[PDB]
A paper describes a structure:
[name], one of the sorting nexin (SNX) family members, regulates the trafficking of endosomal receptors (protein cargoes) from EEs to recycling endosomes. [name] contains three domains: the PDZ (PSD-95, Dlg, and ZO-1) domain at N terminus, the PX (phox homology) domain in the middle, and the FERM (4.1, ezrin, radixin, moesin) domain at C terminus. The [name]-[name] or [name]-[name]-2 coronavirus receptor ACE2 belongs to type I transmembrane protein, and it owns a large extracellular region at the N terminus and one short intracellular C-terminal tail. We here established the interaction between PDZ binding motif ([name]) at the C terminal of ACE2 and PDZ domain of sorting nexin 27 ([name]) and solved the crystal structure of ACE2-[name]/[name]-PDZ complex.
Numbering used by the authors:
A (entry chain B): 201 to 207
B (entry chain A): 40 to 135
Write the structure that this text describes.
Amino acid sequence: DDVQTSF
Amino acid sequence: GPRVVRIVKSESGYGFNVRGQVSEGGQLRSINGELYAPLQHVSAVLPGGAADRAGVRKGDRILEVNHVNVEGATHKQVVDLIRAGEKELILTVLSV
């Protein structure tokens, strides 16, 4: 799947 | 063509999101006539944040983080490399 992270 | 963007981290961060595959094995994609393994991409840019002001754009596909190749990498591998920057980040990207 696709995952997201905030920077 | 690939381009290189320097982003200096602010006290609130870099101001961008990254989205991509959890595990290896994603589909190949042709960009500018060149075939690439899966690339994590910039999925959002905070307006007025550090990445925005430095020229990072939504959809930018990440080839390298601090000159470490991340083509075909997992999401965690790319996340860990960005956090190892520690107040400075160099992204090599393919913009849309």
